[PDB]
């Protein structure tokens, strides 16, 4: 589908999402880049947890939505 995700390198990539796509099921799609180690990598919109077991549909997040991710600059 048509989505705008943000990477740690401000790269613009595309992502596919299905109707019943769960937050856990989508983990495979994000791996398409290069296996992101950051287990705490999620988006900052309507307080949505990427680790939880919620689906994108429950958050009314349809294609062409505004999904902003967090930059993994600081390791900790």
From Swiss-Prot:
Post-translational modifications: Phosphorylated at Ser-65 by PINK1 during mitophagy. Phosphorylated ubiquitin specifically binds and activates parkin (PRKN), triggering mitophagy. Phosphorylation does not affect E1-mediated E2 charging of ubiquitin but affects discharging of E2 enzymes to form polyubiquitin chains. It also affects deubiquitination by deubiquitinase enzymes such as USP30. Mono-ADP-ribosylated at the C-terminus by PARP9, a component of the PPAR9-DTX3L complex. ADP-ribosylation requires processing by E1 and E2 enzymes and prevents ubiquitin conjugation to substrates such as histones.
Compartment annotation: Cytoplasm; Nucleus
Effect of residue 48 to R: No effect on HLTF-mediated polyubiquitination of PCNA
Effect annotated for changing residue 72 to G: No effect on ADP-ribosylation
Domain Ubiquitin-like: 1-76
Modified residues ((Microbial infection) ADP-ribosylthreonine): 66
Modified sites of kind ADP-ribosylglycine: 76
Annotated effect of mutating residue 72 to K: No effect on ADP-ribosylation
Crosslink position(s): Glycyl lysine isopeptide (Lys-Gly) (interchain with G-Cter in ubiquitin): 6, 11, 27, 29, 33, 48, 63
Crosslinked positions (Glycyl lysine isopeptide (Gly-Lys) (interchain with K-? in acceptor proteins)): 76
Phenotype when changing residue 74 to K: No effect on ADP-ribosylation
Phosphoserine modifications at: 65
Residues annotated as site: Essential for function: 68
UniProt site (Interacts with activating enzyme): 54, 72
Function: Exists either covalently attached to another protein, or free (unanchored). When covalently bound, it is conjugated to target proteins via an isopeptide bond either as a monomer (monoubiquitin), a polymer linked via different Lys residues of the ubiquitin (polyubiquitin chains) or a linear polymer linked via the initiator Met of the ubiquitin (linear polyubiquitin chains).
Protein name: Ubiquitin
């Amino acid at each position: 589908m048509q989505i705008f995700v943000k990477t740690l390198t401000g790269k613009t990539i595309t992502l596919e999402v299905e109707p019943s796509d769960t937050i856990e099921n989508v983990k495979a799609k994000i791996q398409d880049k290069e296996g992101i180690p950051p287990d705490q990598q999620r988006l900052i919109f309507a307080g949505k947890q990427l680790e939880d077991g919620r689906t994108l549909s429950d958050y009314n997040i349809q294609k062409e939505s505004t999904l902003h991710l967090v930059l993994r600059l600081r390791g900790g």
